[PDB]
Amino acid sequence: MKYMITSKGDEKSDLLRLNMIAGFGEYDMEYDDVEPEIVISIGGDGTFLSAFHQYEERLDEIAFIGIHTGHLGFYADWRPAEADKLVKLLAKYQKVSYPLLKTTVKYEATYLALNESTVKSSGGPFVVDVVINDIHFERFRGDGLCMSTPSGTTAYNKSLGGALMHPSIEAMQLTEMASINNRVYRTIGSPLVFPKHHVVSLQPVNDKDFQISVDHLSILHRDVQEIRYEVSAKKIHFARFRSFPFWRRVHDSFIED
Amino acid sequence: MKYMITSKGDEKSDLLRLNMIAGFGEYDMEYDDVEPEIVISIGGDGTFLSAFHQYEERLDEIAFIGIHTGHLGFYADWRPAEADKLVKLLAKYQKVSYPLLKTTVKYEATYLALNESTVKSSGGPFVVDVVINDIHFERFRGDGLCMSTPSGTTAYNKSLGGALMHPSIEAMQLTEMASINNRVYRTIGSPLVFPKHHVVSLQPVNDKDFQISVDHLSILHRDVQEIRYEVSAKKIHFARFRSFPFWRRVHDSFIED
Amino acid sequence: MKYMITSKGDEKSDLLRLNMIAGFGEYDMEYDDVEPEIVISIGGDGTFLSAFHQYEERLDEIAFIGIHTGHLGFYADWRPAEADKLVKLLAKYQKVSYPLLKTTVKYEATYLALNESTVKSSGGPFVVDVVINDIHFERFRGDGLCMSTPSGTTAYNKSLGGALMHPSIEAMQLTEMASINNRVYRTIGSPLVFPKHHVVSLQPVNDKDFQISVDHLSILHRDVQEIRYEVSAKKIHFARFRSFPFWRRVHDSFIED
Amino acid sequence: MKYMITSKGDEKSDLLRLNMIAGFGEYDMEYDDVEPEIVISIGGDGTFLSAFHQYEERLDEIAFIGIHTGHLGFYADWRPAEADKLVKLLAKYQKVSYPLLKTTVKYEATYLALNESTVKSSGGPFVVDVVINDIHFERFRGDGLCMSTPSGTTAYNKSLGGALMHPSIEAMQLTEMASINNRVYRTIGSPLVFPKHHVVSLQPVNDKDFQISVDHLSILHRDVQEIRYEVSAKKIHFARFRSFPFWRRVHDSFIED
Ligand SMILES: Nc1ncnc2c1ncn2[C@@H]1O[C@H](COCC#Cc2nc3c(N)ncnc3n2Cc2ccccc2)[C@@H](O)[C@H]1O
Ligand SMILES: Nc1ncnc2c1ncn2[C@@H]1O[C@H](COCC#Cc2nc3c(N)ncnc3n2Cc2ccccc2)[C@@H](O)[C@H]1O
Ligand SMILES: Nc1ncnc2c1ncn2[C@@H]1O[C@H](COCC#Cc2nc3c(N)ncnc3n2Cc2ccccc2)[C@@H](O)[C@H]1O
Numbered sequence A, B, C, D: 001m002k003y004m005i006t007s008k009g010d011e012k013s014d015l016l017r018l019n020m021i022a023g024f025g026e027y028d029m030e031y032d033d034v035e036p037e038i039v040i041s042i043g044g045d046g047t048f049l050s051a052f053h054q055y056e057e058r059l060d061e062i063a064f065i066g067i068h069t070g071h072l073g074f075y076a077d078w079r080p081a082e083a084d085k086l087v088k089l090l091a092k093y094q095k096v097s098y099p100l101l102k103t104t105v106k107y108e109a110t111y112l113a114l115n116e117s118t119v120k121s122s123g124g125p126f127v128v129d130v131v132i133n134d135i136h137f138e139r140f141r142g143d144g145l146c147m148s149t150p151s152g153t154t155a156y157n158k159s160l161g162g163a164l165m166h167p168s169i170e171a172m173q174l175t176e177m178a179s180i181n182n183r184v185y186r187t188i189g190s191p192l193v194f195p196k197h198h199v200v201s202l203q204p205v206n207d208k209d210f211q212i213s214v215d216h217l218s219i220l221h222r223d224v225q226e227i228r229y230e231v232s233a234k235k236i237h238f239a240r241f242r243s244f245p246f247w248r249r250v251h252d253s254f255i256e257d
């Protein structure tokens, strides 16, 4: 079937990519980077992130596979020495799906995040009213906020004190960035985990310009009226050829390998 | 139908209890503390916790209601001035259900937790191997561990840095208590959120005696071979007469009321 | 003696300033904003911060006084209703001194901080080697670092998990901003408190452009070779007319007033 | 001069101890475990802790030396292969001194801590009023409190989120253990660093029985009226034969060796 391979760009990844293409030439496989059914990423989680956003409009029709040429990644969880076996097994697997985060920015633009979406100020103080399902929950003062997908909880969310969620749980997690807490300003402090169909809305107080990130991309948005967070109805699909449990991936990346 | 009322024991709660019993006498309502269909708790979350464990063998046949004579509780979320209206509406509501945590202690005893279950040492050093779905995840050294239900995340779990989970998510959350982290000992540090059907097993390394807590109860267990944590198949059922959202309960308890 | 008064700029502060000037006119007091011996700040800690940096070249010859027209500040710890008494007592007090932080940026520029100095990347990843007294301590990956003065520990340092230090201790405190910690990248995690004469040096790894903040000021520095942190030999001097203990100031600002 | 050697008790430490005693026999050195001038500890920091408390009444007359038969310790910072060189150099060094923590328990007993002193409840809820220099600072609700010496900040204090203090700073650090924070109960949250001559006093609210730890020792104290913390006037003295900086010790123990 139709496939394509993106590469980190270094010598190691490009030649691993050329070898798999050559290996795919021995099977009924058509290279196509317009409408592929299989997207293979060779590099790190950053390369996989780019591969995801390159084809975020055909998620229901693509099974992703990640190969790590360097250290173990959470999305690129195949060793390079397994590419030939990967080519073989891919020629003739099941699919597992991870939840995604929908970000809506009204002034309206919508973005999909595999890891997380963050909001920071354009330079001055960051102050937003946090609204959960249309009820005002808190007025946040600090450096910013981060809304994480389950699989994204091992990334930026983890460094901010958030919990690690198993990707089978359809949820999003909001964590604070250096929140001010005194007698007058008050935030919840704890990370918040929201289920499907809950809407978290960030609304300006004085400044209306925000630096909004979605995975690796970060754009300054001007005259923002609202930022809306919710678990996406779309999901990313992985091709699994064996058992690599998420908690084992966490152990291999953080405890020891 | 059959009902009963437990009380904090102070003058305020006992006389609120006697007034509701008198109010129930004007309706087709039978007091029965053996097989009640409605269990009303008057006091704080501690009183509600006791009411829960008093009838933990008839959870599928009981709808709980909590009344707070003091400050707002997460389970006792009815003001005392609403008892007469509560009696009326209860005479003729829907049910919402929260997940529970199953704790298995092998030497075998099983316990149900509405808030959380914690493990600490019997005095010496606390060292356990943490096993997730039969794979060894980490060797924990520290003061102890805490496995929290969703509704329990606002309690002990919150004070340990855990995330607040909406009770619609069937999950459990494990948080660390003063874990040692240096070149030789290594824990994940972050809280871990587990879905249904994941089993977390704590296993001794040297000392086999542990102080195990389940909600308010805390018992020293001797010659422990394993402690097993998993989301319970049983659920607690609340009688809801109006909308009091969980995130609003969080806001009222922690931000301001 | 010579004095001057800076104001927040609102109607409340300007008219409090005009009343104190009028009150000072009844005494042997000369207004002079070039070489004052007494600098009075009317507003918040931000106004006091500006008053400090306005005269940072005559610190050994100035006693600062802060008046808070809004909430209690840590530097502006005089209520507006005490200005007349303040004018009187100032006409005829002792001095207490707080440590300051010296920041050296080599490409060489030196800055003095009353609260803290922070380092962040110019957009990309922030990676610096942390060198303590010429020995390499760690390679930091994350959002940035913050070096705080003692009196500054109640400000940005506090929101990042740092400890509150009594200003009698001549020290500086380094805290991390969302540090990455996995199998490959490793930071200390804990805040670090350094005594006088210890030098903490930040040194680039790839990117050489950093956004460096000093109190309220924040400037993008290009082609940085090193950022050096050390407890300053200069100190800020406060005019004290009564006992307002630091721990009481902490209690009034964070516990309740 | 007079000396003695304490041992971990394993085969490795006992025979290292016998070899150094034999090596000391070739010099003008007298073994004496009653009034030694040099106390050598062979084992880990736990062995050194025991050696410290064994001679805590002759601290002004003893220079301590620690040898680690296992991993690197913060007090036992000499490799076993250097014992012969240690014997030689000790035969003919300077002294460095670290601050200590004085704990007073009134009902009156006083204890000295090299690492820290902690307070927990006897089983029920732990509630204490925290008083700093006779002013009431906070009412603490939680699992307990920990007051750490500077060199103790790398131990229990570190696991509780406290800052690492260089031992040249004469100070103590108070950190919280799972403090409850909601609308009604409020603690400072941040670690507190106190200078010399500041007195921190813990005072009961309901329960008067506390489990008080001092380094490795932990005793249940009954009918406590007050627990007083302050930087001790006594200091521990180390024999230094070379430069092993504290920050290097921190790096070797926590970053990598
Ligand atoms: N302070 C920060 N701590 C943690 N991550 C941060 C921080 N700042 C920005 N980012 C991130 O950059 C990302 C864009 O680039 C590609 C990627 C990725 C990735 N994804 C994961 C994951 N799911 N699990 C574990 N490792 C991961 N990495 C690897 C990684 C670890 C640490 C830093 C950067 C990258 C964006 O996904 C932000 O999360
Ligand atoms: N350090 C600690 N921090 C927080 N809680 C702790 C700590 N130590 C032990 N407990 C707890 O005692 C409980 C048994 O008594 C009854 C109850 C309850 C309760 N449940 C909740 C809840 N779900 N949401 C919010 N408030 C709650 N409370 C009120 C409450 C707040 C703080 C302390 C105690 C009680 C057991 O449920 C442990 O969680
Ligand atoms: N996330 C953050 N959390 C905390 N402070 C942050 C954060 N981001 C930037 N700042 C800060 O802005 C400052 C420049 O403006 C003037 C000032 C001041 C001040 N000084 C103190 C103090 N010593 N003690 C208590 N209150 C203080 N404030 C008041 C205050 C509290 C919180 C935010 C801003 C201001 C600079 O001193 C940064 O510390």
Ligand SMILES: Nc1ncnc2c1ncn2[C@@H]1O[C@H](COCC#Cc2nc3c(N)ncnc3n2Cc2ccccc2)[C@@H](O)[C@H]1O
Binding pocket: B141, B142, B143, B178, B179, B180, D045, D046, D047, D049, D074, D115, D116, D151, D152, D153, D154, D155, D156, D157, D159, D215, D216
């Ligand atoms: N959760 C906890 N985390 C950290 N330490 C804890 C915890 N619980 C109790 N202790 C401690 O046991 C101690 C008594 O035994 C001897 C000792 C020592 C020691 N001293 C230090 C130090 N100064 N620097 C680094 N390593 C140290 N260790 C080694 C060590 C590390 C971790 C646990 C135990 C021991 C007492 O000093 C408590 O601090």
